[PDB]
Every structure is written in C-alpha cells, then in structure tokens.
C-alpha cells in the first residue's frame, strides 16, 4: 500500500528508433547510437520477435530496470547466422577477432534476434560486408574504415589486387533458402559504462493511485 507516485514518464529513451530499423548497419561499421538524458525504457524488450536470444555480462536481465547507470553506448550489426555465440567477451573467433570484440569487463548485455525476411531476400542483398583480415588484432571498441589491400608478402602491392595482396571485405551471402545456422540474426549490444556523471539514464518507475 506504499505510495510510489512519481512525475510523468518524461521523454522515452529512443531505442526502438534503433531497433525498428529500416536497414541496419554492417559490422564493417557501427551505429554507435549515443542515447542522452532520458528515462531508460529497457523494460520494453520482450516484444521484439519470437525466439529473442538474450544473455547479459554483468547485469541482472530482469532487475536491470532499477539499476541506474551513467551513460549508454548503443550500436548494432547484423551478423552471419551461427556466429551469434561469437559475440562474447574473451571468446576468440572470426568476427570476434577482426570485426568487433567485447572487453572482458563489459558489464552490459547482448541482444540478438532472428531477421530472416527483413534482411534476406530471394534476389540477394550483398550490401552488407565484413572484415577479412588486418595488420593486427583490433583493440576493443575500435572502428576500422580503411579499405587498404593487405600485405601478406614482403612487398607492398600499393594498388594492385594480387597474390598475397587481398581486399578486406566480403559480402554477407544471404539467400532465404539458407539454413538456420546461416540465417541472419540481428545482434545488438548496449554499453552500461560507469563515468563521472550524474547518471542521466535511469529506468522509469511505476506509480500508485490517489
């Protein structure tokens, strides 16, 4: 019977603005959508899609609402089907080693859901790409845009696409007739980092009656 009355919902933190995407971003880049001061509407997450694969790395999935944190770093990427479990801190792989890696101390949670129809089409959408190699393993939370042809030999090919001189992007081979292991899911992640700030992003609270 305790009174928990609070002011109005204020301004929705725009998330579905990101999740309800017309076209998501390739892993080659990141949406990196910064969400500023508002009420962290994380609560509304179950109504994404059937078989929403969710699993966190430091915050209670359900009691996340009350834990107000400082800021949020939100980015998205569609990924090759089976590679969902590649997105995990301290787990090496293909994408996790040359596309995007989560630091071990990443307190946030990982959200993934199947895409299928929206992404995959019978004609084939080769728009999305992914990295093929690099001079060295990327530092975590870093963005690579260079389209430089690799130097696998003792000789810099400069601008000729040659033996041991490779191009760093191949497309997401996405045909709807592909298997569940190959079906494109949509994997996003939300950073819950701590800083020196008044924690301008908190979950909303319910209210009682008069």
């Amino acid at each position: 019977e305790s009174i928990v009355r609070f002011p109005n919902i204020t301004n929705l933190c725009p998330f579905d603005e990101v999740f309800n995407a017309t076209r998501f971003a390739s892993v080659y880049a990141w949406n990196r959508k910064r969400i500023s001061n508002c009420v962290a509407d994380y609560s509304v997450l179950y109504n994404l899609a059937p078989f929403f694969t969710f699993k966190c790395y430091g915050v209670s999935p359900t009691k996340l609402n009350d834990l107000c944190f400082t800021n949020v770093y939100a980015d998205s990427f569609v990924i090759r089907g089976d590679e969902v479990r590649q997105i995990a801190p301290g787990q090496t792989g293909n994408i996790a080693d040359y596309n995007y890696k989560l630091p071990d101390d990443f307190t946030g949670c990982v959200i993934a859901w199947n895409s299928n129809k929206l992404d995959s089409k019978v004609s084939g959408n080769y728009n999305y790409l992914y990295r093929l190699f690099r001079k060295s393993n990327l530092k975590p939370f870093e963005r690579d845009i260079s389209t430089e042809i690799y130097q696998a030999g003792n000789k810099p090919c400069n601008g000729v696409a040659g033996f041991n001189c490779y191009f760093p992007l191949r497309s997401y081979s996405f045909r709807p007739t592909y298997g569940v292991g190959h079906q494109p899911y949509r994997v996003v992640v939300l950073s819950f980092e701590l800083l020196h700030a008044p924690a301008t992003v908190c979950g909303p609270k319910k209210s009682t009656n008069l």
């Binding site: 696998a152 030999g153 003792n154």
Partner: peptide, 11 residues
C-alpha cells in the same frame, strides 16, 4: 599452396 603465417605469406 604457400605457407601462410596469419600475418604474412611467403610469396
């Protein structure tokens, strides 16, 4: 095939 060290391959 050439030997490929993950960073360089012997041309």
């Amino acid at each position: 095939a050439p030997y490929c060290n993950r960073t360089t391959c012997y041309d």
